[PDB]
């Protein structure tokens, strides 16, 4: 129950010719950019509170340690968003983004809507390197602004570093995004009615994208509760290690798992995006 | 595209594998770093690497581990090949007494598709050498002489070693069982 | 920011004299009963599908492996609920429940409402051993049935083994209980307006009770959005290892952490429940 | 018109050597296991509804009183299936099943198909005690699963306690099984074309097995409506009290009555199954 | 959950003014006619076979003893139908039928269709005593014959004594009428789509009318399987002793139980039929 | 109620601790099973047990590890005290040559409150004994003789051993630093 590269290539091409394919890009898409972890950044900020860096990481997950800065030392949480903006969007990360085959193969296609969950600017900046125009959509003021219909709309699902009050990084902010009331969430509610999604750069043990995978399936079934049940467009999830139990769970959430070649992570994603063209 | 993926971290174990199973179209190669369990029993270590390596790569994986068992040290090094190599490179031919030199070189493969593990074990009986002799090998090949020869593993060529080493008979068994 | 046994004893006693203390019992409360894990039970059922027991546990969490039985082999999921009912409610588990000081100290108090998340019957059966009456509330038919006001109402928050369609054990069932639409959820919505909660038997890495801890705080703040902000009753969470970061997070969720003695797990919980008397 | 033990022994042996004998086991086969009645269990559950146990039994048959729980208090019907699973499949019932000569003589023969109408697991568990493999067949998912040809297939004709939605115990469930549309019914439609049946453990006043005895005869006569009428294999019904009118009725339903010794019920059934060997 | 005489009188009157009420008359309707039992008649015919009359009744139910005459001595079964025709339709039974208030109150209403399950002619003969015309419908030749639209059609559901091959009295004949393939059964399949039924003269322990009560409900639910579920007309069952569990079962079979006065059986049925007028 | 919790699994290490620090009201005792890291360096092992034991108990914990370092084996056993004790109980006095017998017994404590780890290390220089002599000790106390004496650890009493053993000087340092 797992597609290969050559099997999923005519399936993704049929969704793209009629304009109903939306990428949903994760943290693994920014892996060739050699960015800092963020868990390493939050551990070095804990030295001022008396923590050793290996000891502060012991007391919980990354969003839980950011919850601790949000309530006990709020000036260090704003310091964390500050030095991620210097690191994730540095000039060295732009130079790797010029030569990355993943970001070139993404920008070679005329997308209409691209979703991403990472905070850096390298999804839009890939489109600017190909001479294409992109529109960042993170806050309410971004949707209200005018733009052309030719411009690909890149919705920052968890905020952008140039709008620091849109960042979803504290644990309480992840819990209140489960109600789906943010402006990126309301845009997702209408796009799942018409489109198929291509999830790239996630793991099966994320537990945040798994709730989103569940909730998209529940909103598709709720949208056809009184009418006869019609068949929906299949979503897709590109993986390098699929496992043996998790692709069967994802199939009931309207998501087909694509096994990519695990020898070179960046090349096999680039061959997937070039087979759509 | 491959079906089975051999996971290794030693750079010379990879070069000997690809001399034998390099032409097979359905064997891939991965270098994921997994946390090595340490134990004396080879059957215990190789069976625990296959769980630890399947968690890392999540594809059908093949792992490998070696063991040297000296009768003068009563089964040691055993499958503790990492902490003795980081302490006694080839000076291990000195720290054991010169009267009784016999030992056994052992190797083990384990392939795991996710549902079940299968362990292959070969073994070569030999005796440790008085001094380190040779360059062409890895981890104890200059100080191990098989039974029958006067010549160590590292003094042999690559084709000569794989007709005596435990890892040479395992790779022929791995070809016929997995159909590589 | 962590209470001890003697510091939290007058705080719990003040809530109990005016009838506003509700226990919220977890899986650690059934620890002295020597029950099977359930993850061990689901691994032995996977032998018929060709899995080794240590290999089937590798492919995900316990609720995710139960998702796999719900969609690929539904007769093994009903087998799992069957042999948990033979094991969790056996005669050997009742005999340990007679002599357990945790279950005796729980039943020595005249509670009005007891919440529990575990499937076994040993929360009500502790009350039956003390000669007291208990009312099991898991389904809609349980709430509709008549009962006296003297009877302590024990609400099974995740179902009961004698009503197998109320069991919340599949991963998709945990996700749809996050909307809080079940009859145990609607009872929780009204009880958080008036009562304080005593959480016993959980870990900080549960990620299901953490959403409940968040959502109770959000429903308290939403219930006073137009009126002036008044102070609510503090909830409590008894722990044997509190850590160093997690009690500060829990304090902003209206929950005070009680450090119990970690040398004997069962005795220190029993000294907590006897200090309320 | 009634066979004895020695007269029916070469008749049953001829059907068994060519593999065309299927046991059809009733509630009297689980008599030495000292199980609760079920009518006693449903009467004690009626105390919560205000019934005395001798008064609730007055208002109808057992399947009719279970109809009353299915429509007026559905949580007590699931309680009934729960506490039959604790009682019929207890460890005390397994220990009597080890030493029962009826269950040992059943498992000493290499059967191909065994039918049973009782809910407990002691027909398969007799085969597991003899070191033989058995396959439980109750639902659609059981038939779809793979198995070897050496394994004796034990079809639960009225469901199994580990699959509670397969239980045929409500009166409306007995009436809708008269149409013969269940997966155990469709397997019976093909097995009556080729096999002879050995009915053990029923009474003449059951009125449910009498419809099955009629309907098997009607399906044999319907299967040869256009071809010349050929002689079918005789079925068998082992009884301790045969009576005087009922064996003549059963003979026209292709069933020969075997009179067993009524002094010891369990021993005379065991001598019947050992004469087949 | 049981109607009285005055409560059910406007409910039956509303069904009768629009012509959608059909009586379904049982053996208790012929109770004031002082007819022989039939079980007494079949016991006296067993004297020629060597049976004492109290001993022949011991070996089974009445339809089972008639099964014994159908296969072992067929000339005594035709003797039984012969001497029921002399006894049930005698001149003494007609004289009691003239003065019976049950039969006068039945014939005072302009019915369109009357169903009955008893073999005697006293349902039509009540209509002939009131100067009204009746059409007996038992066989295929009866339906094919011509008649006017004013004539009340009396369908003999189990045959008539003047057409002895239509009699449903053998046990095998009761089992093959459960498939509903007789011409009275095919007429019942169309009348349940439009009409409400008034069941008079049955007991709750009949087990033949209970299958008919179940199967009518199943055919109503099957007739609206694709369309939206609409509310059907309620059927009615007049009883002198209703009990406490059985009226709740009958309510789910679209049948409301009417409690009549048990002091005088014949008078309370007559007050029911006169309240419809 | 205690403040610091000593976590141990050996039943005889606990009995020697409670002979010294048993009267202290602010030291508790836990027996949580934690996964032992295996390495030759004692400083590496004891610093990794404190993370692994704080994750298990989540209270301010004190851990302990020992090391035997023989010059004939070039620093081995080191902090690998588990895999040699499961293979050479006291036959380890035989597998090393009889000319050079010198060795060093080392011990280490590490206490971790959650924010920072503090490591205490003592050390005793001695020489391995020709044969196993004595009953009263644990893991190598019959075959280790300190410098100065003619008598092994297991031949000594409990008060005599804790005035020579590395774990005796550590428990006096642990009293004064934690204020036990």
XYZ file of N, CA, C and O in Angstrom, chain D residues 106-207:
408
model
N -13.952 -35.607 21.399
C -14.176 -34.770 20.226
C -12.862 -34.397 19.557
O -12.751 -34.429 18.327
N -11.852 -34.051 20.352
C -10.581 -33.590 19.816
C -9.660 -34.722 19.391
O -8.630 -34.453 18.768
N -9.996 -35.972 19.706
C -9.185 -37.102 19.276
C -9.372 -37.439 17.804
O -8.605 -38.243 17.268
N -10.364 -36.852 17.146
C -10.658 -37.106 15.748
C -10.234 -35.918 14.898
O -10.303 -34.766 15.333
N -9.793 -36.208 13.677
C -9.347 -35.172 12.747
C -10.555 -34.686 11.962
O -10.833 -35.145 10.855
N -11.284 -33.741 12.545
C -12.434 -33.174 11.866
C -11.984 -32.139 10.843
O -10.886 -31.585 10.918
N -12.855 -31.883 9.873
C -12.637 -30.821 8.902
C -13.459 -29.581 9.200
O -12.991 -28.465 8.962
N -14.671 -29.761 9.714
C -15.574 -28.661 10.014
C -16.397 -29.051 11.230
O -16.956 -30.150 11.268
N -16.450 -28.172 12.225
C -17.271 -28.372 13.413
C -18.182 -27.165 13.569
O -17.707 -26.026 13.625
N -19.481 -27.414 13.631
C -20.464 -26.378 13.899
C -20.846 -26.399 15.370
O -20.930 -27.465 15.983
N -21.075 -25.219 15.933
C -21.589 -25.116 17.289
C -22.454 -23.872 17.407
O -22.274 -22.897 16.674
N -23.417 -23.926 18.322
C -24.373 -22.847 18.511
C -24.184 -22.114 19.830
O -24.869 -21.115 20.071
N -23.279 -22.575 20.685
C -23.030 -21.940 21.969
C -21.884 -20.939 21.867
O -21.018 -21.040 20.996
N -21.900 -19.958 22.767
C -21.065 -18.777 22.603
C -19.657 -18.967 23.142
O -18.756 -18.219 22.749
N -19.455 -19.939 24.026
C -18.183 -20.108 24.706
C -17.121 -20.667 23.757
O -17.408 -21.115 22.648
N -15.875 -20.643 24.218
C -14.725 -20.995 23.399
C -14.285 -22.441 23.571
O -13.207 -22.809 23.096
N -15.096 -23.272 24.211
C -14.648 -24.584 24.650
C -14.728 -25.645 23.563
O -14.328 -26.787 23.804
N -15.220 -25.301 22.376
C -15.137 -26.230 21.257
C -13.772 -26.129 20.587
O -13.151 -27.147 20.266
N -13.271 -24.906 20.389
C -11.918 -24.745 19.871
C -10.884 -25.107 20.920
O -9.853 -25.704 20.599
N -11.143 -24.744 22.178
C -10.171 -24.977 23.229
C -9.963 -26.442 23.544
O -8.921 -26.819 24.080
N -10.945 -27.284 23.219
C -10.727 -28.723 23.281
C -9.715 -29.165 22.235
O -8.887 -30.043 22.496
N -9.756 -28.552 21.050
C -8.798 -28.886 20.004
C -7.409 -28.346 20.317
O -6.409 -28.964 19.938
N -7.321 -27.202 21.000
C -6.020 -26.679 21.405
C -5.396 -27.512 22.515
O -4.167 -27.547 22.642
N -6.216 -28.179 23.330
C -5.675 -29.020 24.392
C -5.082 -30.308 23.844
O -4.188 -30.890 24.468
N -5.558 -30.768 22.692
C -5.014 -31.948 22.041
C -3.848 -31.625 21.118
O -3.404 -32.500 20.370
N -3.345 -30.393 21.151
C -2.251 -30.011 20.285
C -2.642 -29.753 18.852
O -1.766 -29.698 17.983
N -3.927 -29.592 18.574
C -4.415 -29.357 17.226
C -4.769 -27.888 17.040
O -5.004 -27.152 18.001
N -4.797 -27.465 15.783
C -5.082 -26.083 15.432
C -6.538 -25.939 15.016
O -7.093 -26.813 14.345
N -7.153 -24.833 15.423
C -8.541 -24.549 15.105
C -8.667 -23.115 14.617
O -7.913 -22.233 15.032
N -9.630 -22.893 13.729
C -9.893 -21.579 13.159
C -11.326 -21.186 13.481
O -12.267 -21.862 13.054
N -11.490 -20.101 14.229
C -12.815 -19.618 14.600
C -13.391 -18.832 13.432
O -12.727 -17.950 12.877
N -14.626 -19.147 13.054
C -15.303 -18.479 11.948
C -16.655 -17.981 12.433
O -17.592 -18.771 12.580
N -16.759 -16.688 12.678
C -18.020 -16.109 13.123
C -18.468 -14.924 12.285
O -19.664 -14.783 12.025
N -17.545 -14.075 11.854
C -17.869 -12.862 11.124
C -17.284 -12.933 9.723
O -16.612 -13.896 9.354
N -17.556 -11.885 8.941
C -17.052 -11.819 7.573
C -15.537 -11.678 7.544
O -14.876 -12.208 6.646
N -14.968 -10.974 8.525
C -13.521 -10.821 8.598
C -12.816 -12.122 8.955
O -11.628 -12.269 8.653
N -13.516 -13.064 9.589
C -12.908 -14.350 9.907
C -12.755 -15.214 8.664
O -11.739 -15.897 8.503
N -13.756 -15.205 7.780
C -13.667 -15.980 6.546
C -12.628 -15.407 5.593
O -11.970 -16.164 4.872
N -12.453 -14.086 5.587
C -11.503 -13.451 4.682
C -10.052 -13.717 5.063
O -9.174 -13.617 4.201
N -9.779 -14.058 6.320
C -8.427 -14.279 6.772
C -7.840 -15.581 6.263
O -8.558 -16.546 5.996
N -6.518 -15.634 6.125
C -5.878 -16.834 5.581
C -5.657 -17.907 6.637
O -5.508 -17.624 7.828
N -5.620 -19.154 6.169
C -5.404 -20.312 7.027
C -4.978 -21.488 6.159
O -5.121 -21.466 4.935
N -4.452 -22.518 6.811
C -4.020 -23.724 6.123
C -5.188 -24.688 5.949
O -6.241 -24.548 6.573
N -4.988 -25.680 5.080
C -6.019 -26.682 4.834
C -6.066 -27.756 5.912
O -7.083 -28.445 6.034
N -4.995 -27.916 6.689
C -4.986 -28.901 7.762
C -5.831 -28.460 8.953
O -6.276 -29.308 9.733
N -6.080 -27.163 9.089
C -6.723 -26.613 10.277
C -8.216 -26.905 10.228
O -8.880 -26.643 9.219
N -8.743 -27.461 11.316
C -10.180 -27.648 11.446
C -10.868 -26.301 11.618
O -10.492 -25.504 12.481
N -11.877 -26.048 10.792
C -12.615 -24.794 10.828
C -13.822 -24.949 11.740
O -14.722 -25.746 11.457
N -13.841 -24.194 12.830
C -14.936 -24.227 13.789
C -15.804 -23.005 13.530
O -15.407 -21.875 13.831
N -16.988 -23.219 12.969
C -17.898 -22.128 12.647
C -18.839 -21.911 13.824
O -19.602 -22.807 14.200
N -18.763 -20.724 14.418
C -19.679 -20.296 15.470
C -20.976 -19.850 14.817
O -21.056 -18.760 14.249
N -22.003 -20.694 14.907
C -23.239 -20.461 14.173
C -24.057 -19.320 14.765
O -24.826 -18.687 14.037
N -23.895 -19.030 16.056
C -24.604 -17.934 16.705
C -23.660 -16.908 17.321
O -24.048 -16.204 18.259
N -22.434 -16.806 16.824
C -21.511 -15.781 17.264
C -20.560 -16.266 18.344
O -20.655 -17.383 18.857
N -19.621 -15.388 18.688
C -18.587 -15.684 19.666
C -18.523 -14.532 20.656
O -18.817 -13.389 20.306
N -18.114 -14.832 21.891
C -18.069 -13.807 22.926
C -16.963 -12.782 22.709
O -17.052 -11.681 23.261
N -15.933 -13.096 21.926
C -14.904 -12.106 21.636
C -15.279 -11.179 20.488
O -14.550 -10.222 20.221
N -16.389 -11.449 19.805
C -16.939 -10.571 18.776
C -18.386 -10.316 19.167
O -19.294 -11.018 18.703
N -18.636 -9.324 20.032
C -19.969 -9.199 20.652
C -21.076 -8.792 19.697
O -22.250 -9.017 20.013
N -20.751 -8.218 18.544
C -21.763 -7.857 17.561
C -22.211 -9.034 16.702
O -23.100 -8.862 15.863
N -21.619 -10.212 16.886
C -22.048 -11.419 16.197
C -22.994 -12.272 17.027
O -23.489 -13.282 16.520
N -23.257 -11.889 18.279
C -24.061 -12.699 19.190
C -25.514 -12.708 18.740
O -26.127 -11.652 18.544
N -26.073 -13.902 18.581
C -27.488 -14.078 18.281
C -28.150 -14.508 19.583
O -28.148 -15.689 19.942
N -28.669 -13.537 20.321
C -29.320 -13.797 21.600
C -30.635 -13.051 21.794
O -31.496 -13.539 22.532
N -30.831 -11.912 21.145
C -32.091 -11.190 21.152
C -33.094 -11.937 20.271
O -32.706 -12.620 19.320
N -34.386 -11.840 20.623
C -35.433 -12.556 19.890
C -35.529 -12.093 18.441
O -35.763 -12.903 17.537
N -35.360 -10.790 18.206
C -35.369 -10.269 16.845
C -34.175 -10.767 16.047
O -34.263 -10.900 14.822
N -33.060 -11.058 16.718
C -31.912 -11.621 16.023
C -32.138 -13.080 15.653
O -31.605 -13.543 14.643
N -32.915 -13.821 16.449
C -33.259 -15.188 16.067
C -34.214 -15.215 14.883
O -34.142 -16.118 14.042
N -35.123 -14.243 14.808
C -36.077 -14.207 13.706
C -35.422 -13.823 12.387
O -35.827 -14.327 11.334
N -34.421 -12.948 12.409
C -33.769 -12.560 11.168
C -32.694 -13.546 10.734
O -32.208 -13.446 9.604
N -32.317 -14.491 11.592
C -31.483 -15.602 11.161
C -32.285 -16.726 10.525
O -31.687 -17.683 10.026
N -33.617 -16.634 10.525
C -34.428 -17.625 9.834
C -34.407 -17.437 8.324
O -34.763 -18.365 7.593
N -34.004 -16.262 7.845
C -33.850 -16.028 6.417
C -32.567 -16.622 5.860
O -32.443 -16.720 4.634
N -31.633 -17.003 6.736
C -30.338 -17.602 6.399
C -29.508 -16.694 5.489
O -29.209 -17.024 4.341
N -29.125 -15.542 6.031
C -28.309 -14.585 5.303
C -26.991 -14.256 5.988
O -26.191 -13.507 5.417
N -26.743 -14.784 7.183
C -25.492 -14.557 7.880
C -24.366 -15.354 7.219
O -24.627 -16.311 6.490
N -23.110 -14.956 7.426
C -21.975 -15.757 6.921
C -21.892 -17.169 7.496
O -21.423 -18.063 6.777
N -22.302 -17.453 8.751
C -22.439 -18.879 9.101
C -23.580 -19.572 8.382
O -23.531 -20.794 8.207
N -24.603 -18.832 7.956
C -25.718 -19.449 7.250
C -25.350 -19.779 5.812
O -25.799 -20.794 5.268
N -24.551 -18.921 5.175
C -24.158 -19.157 3.792
C -23.168 -20.305 3.686
O -23.127 -20.998 2.666
N -22.366 -20.515 4.728
C -21.489 -21.677 4.773
C -22.285 -22.959 4.976
O -21.916 -24.010 4.444
N -23.392 -22.882 5.717
C -24.253 -24.042 5.919
C -24.975 -24.442 4.638
O -25.242 -25.629 4.427
N -25.280 -23.470 3.772
C -25.974 -23.752 2.519
C -25.138 -24.604 1.574
O -25.690 -25.389 0.797
N -23.817 -24.464 1.618
C -22.953 -25.262 0.760
C -22.536 -26.574 1.401
O -22.272 -27.546 0.685
N -22.469 -26.631 2.730
C -22.054 -27.857 3.395
C -23.147 -28.911 3.441
O -22.829 -30.098 3.528
N -24.420 -28.521 3.370
C -25.478 -29.524 3.346
C -25.573 -30.244 2.009
O -26.243 -31.277 1.929
N -24.923 -29.728 0.964
C -24.922 -30.394 -0.329
C -24.041 -31.634 -0.343
O -24.276 -32.531 -1.156
N -23.044 -31.710 0.535
C -22.036 -32.754 0.454
C -21.852 -33.569 1.724
O -21.223 -34.629 1.657
N -22.375 -33.131 2.861
C -21.977 -33.671 4.149
C -23.174 -34.228 4.902
O -24.329 -33.924 4.598
N -22.876 -35.057 5.895
C -23.850 -35.505 6.874
C -23.543 -34.845 8.210
O -22.386 -34.562 8.528
N -24.585 -34.595 8.990
C -24.475 -33.814 10.211
C -24.755 -34.681 11.429
O -25.616 -35.564 11.393
N -24.018 -34.421 12.503
C -24.180 -35.109 13.781
C -24.598 -34.070 14.816
O -23.765 -33.303 15.306
N -25.885 -34.048 15.142
C -26.436 -33.078 16.079
C -26.327 -33.636 17.492
O -26.914 -34.678 17.796
N -25.580 -32.948 18.354
C -25.354 -33.386 19.726
C -25.668 -32.229 20.663
O -25.125 -31.132 20.504
N -26.537 -32.473 21.636
C -26.777 -31.529 22.700
C -27.991 -30.642 22.549
O -27.948 -29.490 22.990
N -29.065 -31.135 21.949
C -30.288 -30.373 21.772
C -31.455 -31.109 22.412
O -31.358 -32.280 22.786
N -32.567 -30.399 22.539
C -33.827 -30.976 22.971
C -34.840 -30.873 21.842
O -34.682 -30.083 20.908
N -35.893 -31.684 21.935
C -36.916 -31.668 20.899
C -37.820 -30.448 20.988
O -38.506 -30.133 20.014
N -37.845 -29.762 22.129
C -38.701 -28.599 22.324
C -37.939 -27.290 22.172
O -38.229 -26.318 22.875
N -36.964 -27.245 21.265
C -36.123 -26.061 21.146
C -36.759 -25.002 20.253
O -36.594 -23.803 20.504
N -37.428 -25.435 19.174
C -38.191 -24.656 18.186
C -37.329 -23.730 17.329
O -37.845 -23.076 16.418
